[PDB]
Amino acid sequence: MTLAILAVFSVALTLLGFVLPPQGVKRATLLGLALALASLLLTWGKPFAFGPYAVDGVSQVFTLLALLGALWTVGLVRSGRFEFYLLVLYAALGMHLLASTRHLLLMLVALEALSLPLYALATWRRGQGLEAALKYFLLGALAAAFFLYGAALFYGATGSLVLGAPGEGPLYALALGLLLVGLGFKAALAPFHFWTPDVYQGSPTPVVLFMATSVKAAAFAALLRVAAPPEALALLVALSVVVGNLAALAQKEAKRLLAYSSIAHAGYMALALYTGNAQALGFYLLTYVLATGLAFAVLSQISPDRVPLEALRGLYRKDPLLGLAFLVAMLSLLGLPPLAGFWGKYLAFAEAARAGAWGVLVLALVTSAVSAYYYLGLGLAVFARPEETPFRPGPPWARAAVVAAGVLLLALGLLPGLVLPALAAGG
Amino acid sequence: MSYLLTSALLFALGVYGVLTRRTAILVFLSIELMLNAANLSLVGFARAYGLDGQVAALMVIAVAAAEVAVGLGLIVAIFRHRESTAVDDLSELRG
Amino acid sequence: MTLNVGPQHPSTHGVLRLMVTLSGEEVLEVVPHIGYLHTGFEKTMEHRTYLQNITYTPRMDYLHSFAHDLAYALAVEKLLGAVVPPRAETIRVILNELSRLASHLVFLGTGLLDLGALTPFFYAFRERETILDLFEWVTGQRFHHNYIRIGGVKEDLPEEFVPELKKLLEVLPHRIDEYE
Amino acid sequence: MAPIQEYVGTLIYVGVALFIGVAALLVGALLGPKKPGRAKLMPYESGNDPAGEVKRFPVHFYVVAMLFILFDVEVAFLWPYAVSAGGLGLYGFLGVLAFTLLLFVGFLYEWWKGVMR
Amino acid sequence: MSLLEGLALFLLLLSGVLVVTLRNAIHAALALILNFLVLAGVYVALDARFLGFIQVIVYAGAIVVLFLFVIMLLFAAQGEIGFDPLVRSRPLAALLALGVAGILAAGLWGLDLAFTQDLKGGLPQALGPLLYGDWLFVLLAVGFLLMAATVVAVALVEPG
Amino acid sequence: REGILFTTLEKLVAWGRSNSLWPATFGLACCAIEMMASTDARNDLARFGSEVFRASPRQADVMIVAGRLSKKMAPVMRRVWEQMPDPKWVISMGACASSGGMFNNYAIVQNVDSVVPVDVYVPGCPPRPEALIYAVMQLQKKVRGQAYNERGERLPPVAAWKRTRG
Amino acid sequence: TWSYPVDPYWMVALKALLVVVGLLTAFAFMTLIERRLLARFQVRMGPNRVGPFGLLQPLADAIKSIFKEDIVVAQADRFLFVLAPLISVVFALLAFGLIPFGPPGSFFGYQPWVINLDLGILYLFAVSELAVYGIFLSGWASGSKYSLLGSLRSSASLISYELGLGLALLAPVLLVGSLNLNDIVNWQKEHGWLFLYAFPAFLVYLIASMAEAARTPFDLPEAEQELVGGYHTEYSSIKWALFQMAEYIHFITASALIPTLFLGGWTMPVLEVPYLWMFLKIAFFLFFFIWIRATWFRLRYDQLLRFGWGFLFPLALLWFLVTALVVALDLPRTYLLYLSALSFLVLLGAVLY
Ligand code: SF4
């Protein structure tokens, strides 16, 4: 009954914004998200299904992650337009619906409901932002067409539109492929990656935070429901990680480089899809969401429009806590011990090796070592001499958020045997 | 069965449209054609598997209408002040 | 939209040219352009006798023409020192107020038709037709009547004018109350 | 339901109507003086610029049309409940009421914001 | 069947070719409306009647009407302006279209299905219990999506 | 095809056009108001076939120039006439239109026949509404081929059928 | 078409051709009658000329319409300019066969109607969209943006009220349970005159159909006296005549549909004569509508859009929800009679202040 809370708050605030100041509307949105998260906690171990809508461990964990990312990205945004919060609420409900169902068509409806408000949230009205929004909308509608024809071929290969049906040979394979195309585009996997660098570079940094956390979480949640063949999985992972890290090498801008890094990270997470453990993936995504939200909150404190690499430098001298947290996030995204990003990486690789994919796992690891070049060129740049760069050292809001994110990262890296025991039913 | 093959053909036609068209609006139109090809495949398979693909396609139509509304609003906002819609005119974002 | 509402089209009464600078459903600014009816009275009259000019006065404001007639007659009377008989003065005020009623009728009919409905034009024009029958009775002309003179009026009223004028003065209060 | 024969009769109806329309067009086009002239072909209103050069029209029409597509989708969903009503009981009534209220809240937002714009 | 069925399928394919070929936006849209009409006729032939009627009403009656409104507000009929022609891309696009058709043709080839079910006409009389029922949740999600789309477009234009 | 090349057909189409004469007023001065009086509920040009009144010039055969035609209005009226369907006729109402009238000066065209091919002339200042009806019956029987001048000659059905428009 | 037979295809074609040419003669002589009824309204009299009753003047008018130099304006789209009138005319002509003019066989053996499709109101809605289609399309093809703007005004207003038509038509479907005109008519035979139950829906359908060029938006627009309307101002001989013809056929189709749907499509409580009562109700609505044409002003289509959008369509959906509650709980059918009577009393008492 968390979806009920989400829908009630969205519909109410829609009209309430006429009599309420946008600040009051933002307060209301924050309260609703926190209350939904509290309900998710109190329902831990209470799987609940009504229709095709189903809340299980996966729904709980991934919607927890999405709610966290949405709370963080809303905290930063102070625009006096309550619609800029209505859209976030809509996207949150849509991603919950996406993660909580197996019905392909309801999955499509949830996809559209979560994706449309992001297209509008990508409009700071900066000229690049319109180009980004246009590329995003066009490629997203194309992928929606592909996913819909895949659902049709699924309904062709089997009498139902719900995943798990037995499935035919080549036609079922074709339907599975046509669903995987859209799901990977939404997960920023190569060779469907081209939109991600442009969109991350064009969209405002807090929005990109929201995206790179909640969108990736819900996307991998829905991916776990598919029975993706190992050869297709191998191809996606290889291309994604290779192109991501390589093209990230060439990037001069922090947001675009992070987009390519996120392509490589989606490639990594796609390994747990071999077995679909979802405990390994739940943990991985917990760590990655925290780290990326941290990094993008810092990038938002630096500049919403665009942050170059040199802007990151001197961040320690400016704010030591911010410099240290940014370093920790870069390391957790590199996947290095003793951090929870490393534990998520290890769990995904363990699922992959259990699936018996060796060459693919090796290539992923090589490309991950390649990623250390730019991961260090970001984390260590914090200590360089401050060049001319705009710096607004955040509110205690964002300071405490970034600090708590880094602390949770390191704590679950040191003792994953605390939360990892309850990513299943939740004992 | 001819209907499902015809739907695949219409899908390919809409793909060619999306690739060839210079205008965002005509790209979106080709996308709508792809969506309707999918709806026809759904209707054939609903005739096969008992009518659920009909309600499916209905929901699909509703979703298509919503996304059309949103995308046309975006197209207008991007090319109201700006000149010719040609999508190659926006190349600022590069690798 | 610098839109050109042309002369006589679309159904802009009183032929006029308009450059409506306008975006949307508002009206930003109308640039008027006139001169399509310029006949040159101020020049042609320099080459006509004072008596002849009484044929030129009604034809400019052709709805309330007797106001033109009266203004010109009075100005010439002042200039050359003329004495107007009291009965002629009474007749002149009656004709002026009658042409005033005719002009008011035509104005309101044209407005209601211009925006609104067509129907109420016909009642106003029926009362105007009664007024024009009065004008034919007295002057032999509907409008552009050459009746006023520098001394006074051309000739006296026939017997039949006063009964028909009382008829119209009795029917008119109810009629104007109906329009209201 | 209804037989397909009435639908074939519907096709016949359309064919007859279209044939009659084409006949009328042939008469109108063939019977004429056919003296094209430059000023005759000129669009309207005395030399140039009936509309002339004006920039893109108001988006008010776009707004009306988009509103219309969404509310027409609404009506398209309301029709199956309109036919199958008594069997769906209070539960179907409540579901359709929820759907209607959601789209009417959307309408109320767009109205209190208004489109004179 | 096949006599008029082949006719209807040829009309559908030709209308799609027109909508993707013609450089006049208005002409393409009109080809697409013809496509939707032929497709609703095929729907009716496939016992889906209410769905064909809604395809005419919403898609043709409303959606492409809004499309026409947009392209008439912003003339854009002669699309080939600002070319960046990339002539090499036309044969590559034709190639990609042929391939996306061939892979589906392979997936559906040698595939025969039991098209024998008594839909009883895709009437709303029989579709209602499915829509409000098993599909009631999907319906509510769709309605929420529509409301969100209204608010999205409204805040999206909103000059200020 | 202009209503010609059959003995019965041309008389029938002339009958039709004569009774279906579609007036398009080109109001200039007080002649225009005296023509508006030819439509009121005492004497209506709404019986012979002139009930409807389409302000557009693409929709009427009869062009009634009612008032003084200022030289600045001449090209406008010229193009309104040229922008008419071809089986079209021209009536010149009042003295200012027919001749220069009492305004014989630089401002007013001294014969509207200078700019548009005039079919019928109707003197008067203003011409009585019943004189205008006499003129339209005159034009009616003219397009019926029942019109003759003082010299004995039958008059062609349509003037502006005899001019090298350009 | 549960209970109704089907005539042979040749007989359906014959009936279709008959209905089309009958709509021709109908709109022509109804133009005569509207001219003369307006003339009676404004104390003048009509054309006692070329008739006797004026009934040869439409012949003279058509004879003028042909030979009238059908002109194809340069700078206008050569194909679309010609094409748009055919669309506007065809989709106005059709959708009149559905109207039952009698019990089955009362066409002297075969069928009062042409087609009795199981889903009727959806057919009506779809073909109603296509009139606005033709309107704004001709507005574009005219190649004059002056006309285009009026076409857009037209399209906006007509589309608004055409959407309202659906929420208006929802209510009687709940009661009848069928989308066939004959079934609805027979329901009105049994329980009686569905408008007695659905008066608010009757009103909103009336006011919506008024926006379909009937009158009082009157910023439809017509080219006269405003920013000109669409679909005209560039057509000369036959295509302009076709536009006006289709607008009138839609007018009379709505004037026929109103009694067919809400009131007692023919099926009178007494004397049950097949055609005459339907034609009389058509004539009644036609005369009332002409009264409106004469007697009421414009709306500027801004007030018209405001009114339709804010008042008519919300009211129609509210009444639809009330009727849906009633049918779902099925409690009596008497509650709807009481509710419509009380609603009429309310919407009436607010006038006489
Ligand atoms: S002839 Fe007389 S009535 Fe006509 S415009 Fe001239 S002045 Fe006026």
Numbering used by the authors:
A (entry chain N): 1 to 427
B (entry chain K): 1 to 95
C (entry chain 4): 26 to 205
D (entry chain A): 1 to 117
E (entry chain J): 1 to 160
F (entry chain 6): 16 to 181
G (entry chain H): 2 to 354
Would you copy out the relevant sentences from the publication that reported this structure?
Complex I (NADH:ubiquinone (UQ) oxidoreductase) is the first and the largest enzyme of the respiratory chain, catalysing the transfer of two electrons from NADH to UQ, coupled to the translocation of four protons across the bacterial or inner mitochondrial membrane. All known co-factors of complex I reside in the PA: the primary electron acceptor flavin-mononucleotide (FMN) is connected by the redox chain of seven Fe–S clusters to the quinone-binding site (Q-site) at the interface with the membrane domain. In this work we address this question by building and analyzing atomic structures of nine different conformational states of complex I, which were obtained by X-ray crystallography and single-particle cryo-EM.
Crystallization efficiency and yield were dramatically improved by adding heterologously expressed subunit Nqo16 to the purified complex I (which contains sub-stoichiometric amounts of Nqo16). With the exception of this rotation, both structures share a high degree of structural conservation, which suggests that in practice both of them represent the same conformational state of CXI. The observed differences may be mainly due to the crystal contacts, possibly restraining motion of PA in the CXIINT crystal structure. Indeed in the native crystal structure (CXIINT), corresponding to the CXIMJ state, we can identify many possible proton transfer pathways linking the MD core to the cytosol, while connections to the periplasm do not seem to exist in this state. In CXIINT or CXINADH structures the distance between E32 and E67 is too large for efficient proton transfer (~3.7 Å). The two main states of the complex are shown in green (major-like MJ states, represented by CXIINT, CXINADH, and CXIMJ structures) and blue (minor-like MN states, represented by CXIDQ and CXIMN structures).
